[PDB]
Structure formats: structure tokens, C-alpha cells
Amino acid sequence: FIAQSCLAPGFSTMMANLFAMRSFKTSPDMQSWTNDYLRGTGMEMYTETLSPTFIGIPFAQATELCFSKLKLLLLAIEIKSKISINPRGAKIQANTQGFFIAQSADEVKRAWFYCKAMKYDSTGMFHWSPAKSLEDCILDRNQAAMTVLNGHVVVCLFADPDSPLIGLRNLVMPLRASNFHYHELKHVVIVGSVDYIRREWKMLQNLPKISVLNGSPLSRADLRAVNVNLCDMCCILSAKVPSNDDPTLADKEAILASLNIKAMTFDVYGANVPMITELVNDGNVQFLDQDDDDDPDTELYLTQPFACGTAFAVSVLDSLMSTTYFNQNALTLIRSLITGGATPELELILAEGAGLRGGYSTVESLSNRDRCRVGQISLYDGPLAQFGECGKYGDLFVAALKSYGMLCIGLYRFRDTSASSKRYVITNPPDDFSLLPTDQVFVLMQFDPG
């Protein structure tokens, strides 16, 4: 979830609300942003067999028909055993399960009845490297100062040498998926103790563009060295076992480091630095934000950092246990969207203990690179920017799908119309929704060879 947030900020919140039970609230005393956000939280994922009318037509034409007429968002279909997120040029077979996003199962049932009357790894889904040594990837403070990192990912790690191992590959592997070209890959720099990183560097040897810096994320010298003011996303993670003295005080370094970065000034503003924080407690989320008016009894999903994508709560994983039981396909869709493509045989390859073994690229091995990826786009510029002013969401959804094949999932809109550099997520806005020139759209972009 955190790795996908680096590519598209606010994505973790979008999945947290989508696959969880959200209670809609009605009250005359709430702002306009809460009205749109709350409606998005009621969206849920459902599976339903497609109508006999839908057979024999491409997926792109089928999902736009549901949005235009049936008011449904179709994002994936069942392919025989495989899950295809927004497939390109894939015809619909007989009795194919489809994944829909809707307020409830009432609209979903309308889909069943409807009539007009050595470069990559062995699997080919990830980039590969010739087993770079850990010592070659260690950067000193002076070495980091004399180099410039732009558009990179900073992983702030709070870990002791004896701390339990949390798999850092689960964060870098999604960032090293075969969908991204080698030039557009995001550099990853890890700030933490080399003693802890060495204990798990074995699975990071073959992943390109990884740098390790000695120091602590709390120290401002290290953060200035790696230039977190220009990074695409700064992730704060803690691997230390809590002392269990107080359940609420489990995450002290995470909160202190989060506030430390916001107060830093660069020659520019720390509050403008994109940031995500792993919080193991639900009640500490409100501490990240300061200019809110929420009574501390506020629910988690209505809290300011949560709705804005800047805070990740591990409690949603426990809530995902209930979701899996009621819908077996719920976790299949989630894994296909956040892991960057994790085939079942990839576990078998890793079961041999040789790490990520590479393979020679062939013609039909390279076909695995052609799959959709989670991304974010802006309406500031480009030929699609003309939907920013006086434009409807449905018009944006139809035009992007027909011309580019992108599937619009939601919106990432500024809090204040004014632009306070802190946005909130709206999941699947209605057809008649009004857009803004400074709005960002969650899309599932295709793969363009080049």
C-alpha cells in the first residue's frame, strides 16, 4: 500500500475505504469537502457475471457502457484464472466474472440482466540487476551531499540491529515492476543502520537503484544530505518492537520524525514535502495534522491525515480479514493492484533460496510487461487539460478511455479552492460531478513501449 502511494499519493486511503465497512453520516453542519469524501467512502467492490449482451465486445467499450448507462465502474474481468486490470483489446467470453465499484449491490445486479430493448527476472515482471554488493551501495554523508537526487523515494527506517526483520523487498519490488521503463524508475534511498539492513540485504541485491545511508531519520543532517525536499515520497517506517509499557506510546519516533520534517526549512518548506507515515495506533493519526477542527472522538476514516493519504494505519489490515471471508476475490484484486504482479510461480522461484533469479528476455516473455499500472495525472496542462474548467467527470472518463485507454478511478482535489498543498481523495465521483483546473485523477495507465 505504501509503495503504491509513492507512485500515486493518496492511493492507500482509496483502498482503505474501498475494502472496508464505512458508515455514511448525514448532518447539516459539515463542509463541502466532507460531503464529497463521505460519498466516496461508501463505494465498495462487487463481483457479478456480465450480461449476455456484453459478450463479443472489447473491454474498453464494455466498461464505458456501464459508466454511461448502468452507472457502474468496471475495472477488471475474469480471464481463463487470471485477473486483468483494465485489459486492452480483450474480448469478453461467456460467463466472465467482472469486478465493479458501486455504492451497494443494487447497481451491481443491473450488470447481470441488461438488454437494449539479462535485464528482467525469470517471470519477466520485475527488473533485475547483477547482484550489486551492499558495500558499493553505502553512501556517506559527504558522498550524498556531493550528489543530487531528484524525484526519488526516501525510506526513513527506525530499527535497531536486533530488531525483527520487516521485508523491505515488499516496498521496493512494486517500485521495480516491469511496467515502468528503466528511465522512469524511482531511485530508492534508505536512511538507517547498516547493521539492520545488512541482515536483509540478500533480497535487495538484484533490485536496481538502491542506496543506503548511515544515520538516523531523526537527524536533520542526513535528511538534508539525501534532499528529502525534492523527493517524490518520504516513507517513515518503524521496525522496533514496542516496549509494551503503553499501547498509545508505541510510535514515538514515527510521530517525532513526522513533525521534525514538517518544521524543516530549505534554501524550501517542510510542510510541502510529500510524506507518508506508518502508524501502529489509530488514535495517533490526528497528531500529524494541527490546523484541524476535529473533536478527538472523531472516527479514523474522517480524520484529516487519513482522508488525505498522509497517514497509513495498520489497523486496516486487521479489518481486511473480514473482507476476505465475505468475498474470496477481494484479496485477489488487491494483490494484483499493489504487488506490481506477483505470479504464484514467483514464490516457487524464491522458495529455492537463490533470491530473485534473472532470465533471458524472449518475445513472449516480454509480453508480460503489457499490463495496467496505478498512476496519477493532472489537468494543469496537456491535451486533456480542457476538462479542468466547466468539465464533468463523466466527460473526462469517456474521453480518456477512448483515446488513451486510461480508466479514471477517482479524484485528488485540493482542500481549499483559494490550494494549501494538501488534498483529499474522492472515490468514483458521480457522472454529473464538477471538476476543477487543479484536480488530480487516479488512473490505471497502460504500458507504452518505447
Binding site: 516496549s243 503503553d246 498509545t248 506510546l249 514515538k252 519516533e253 510521530i255 517525532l256 513533525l259 521534525n260 514538517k262 518544521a263 488514535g283 490526528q286 497528531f287 494541527q290 478527538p296 472522538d297
Partner: protein, 168 residues
């Protein structure tokens, strides 16, 4: 089994024109007693300010007797300053100031300072215009308190660094 129930808890009793302070953090005998000797001193000119102690663990017999000798001005409530529910119980917004005590006998002063600082964040989050005075183990941890937007030295917030004052 039904008869047995806890003895510490409940919302702080309210009084007309009542001024009180909340003391949280490390609550032991030889730490509370020293503070109570000066705050409730014999020769202090007549100002009546109640003292509210909020600790997660119930007091032991050594400290229970101290509270008995000051029953008219000292009350104890079981809870955590980090819990917003417990903040309402001690009536934080009615408190004149909030005092945080530090564990002098701690293996890791940095860990103790981080926990103490995080307590101030919870108090400041609950009420912006509250005066907080904190005991801090190490001098280099003072910078973290400056990162809190609600921390204002001119408003009354102050830091007592044991290491700096003792060796100074």
C-alpha cells in the same frame, strides 16, 4: 465476583471558581513528595490550586499515604494522558497548567524524552491554549519540542532540562 469493583476512576469533581493543575508522567513517592513540599508549602501566601495526578498504574502503599495527608488539595485519577477520554475526565480545558514529570532512573534517556514529548503533543492537540511545563532528560531533545506548532514560549510553555540545570 460481581461485588468487587475498582476504586480509582470517575470524572473529576467540579467546583465553582476552581483552579487546578494536572500532573502526569512519572508518579512515584520521592518525586511527587518533593513537588508537593514546595507547591503546598506551609509559608506560601494564600492561593488555593488543586493538584490532579493522572497515572496509568494505581498508587502503591508508600504513595497512597501521601495522598491521604493531602486529601483536601490532592486527588488521583487512574488513566493515561494520551487517551482523549482520560483528558476529559481530568477536565484539561479547565486546568490552569499541565505538568509532565520525567523518570530520572531510566536506562534510555532518549526513549523517556520521546515519550514525554509525545505526551505534550496529546495535551496540545486536545487544547491549544494550555500551559505545559515538561521535565526533559537531555538537552539535545529540546529541539523536538520546538517542532510542535502550538508550543509557544511567550504564552507560558517552558522546558526544565535536568541535565542542563543539574550540571550548570
Amino acid at each position: 465476583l460481581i461485588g468487587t469493583r475498582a476504586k480509582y476512576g470517575g470524572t473529576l469533581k467540579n467546583e465553582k471558581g476552581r483552579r487546578h493543575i494536572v500532573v502526569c508522567g512519572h508518579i512515584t513517592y520521592e518525586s511527587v513528595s518533593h513537588f508537593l513540599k514546595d507547591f503546598l508549602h506551609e509559608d506560601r501566601e494564600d492561593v488555593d490550586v488543586e493538584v490532579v495526578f493522572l497515572h496509568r498504574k494505581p498508587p502503591d502503599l508508600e504513595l497512597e499515604g501521601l495522598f491521604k495527608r493531602h486529601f483536601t488539595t490532592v486527588e488521583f485519577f487512574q488513566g493515561t494522558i494520551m487517551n482523549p477520554i482520560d483528558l476529559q475526565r481530568v477536565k484539561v480545558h479547565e486546568a490552569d497548567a499541565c505538568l509532565v514529570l520525567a523518570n530520572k532512573y531510566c536506562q534510555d534517556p532518549d526513549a523517556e524524552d520521546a515519550a514525554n514529548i509525545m505526551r505534550v503533543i496529546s495535551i496540545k492537540n486536545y487544547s491549544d491554549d494550555i500551559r505545559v511545563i515538561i521535565q526533559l532528560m537531555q538537552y539535545h531533545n529540546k529541539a523536538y519540542l520546538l517542532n510542535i506548532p502550538s508550543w509557544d514560549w511567550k504564552q507560558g510553555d517552558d522546558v526544565i532540562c535536568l541535565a542542563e540545570l543539574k550540571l550548570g
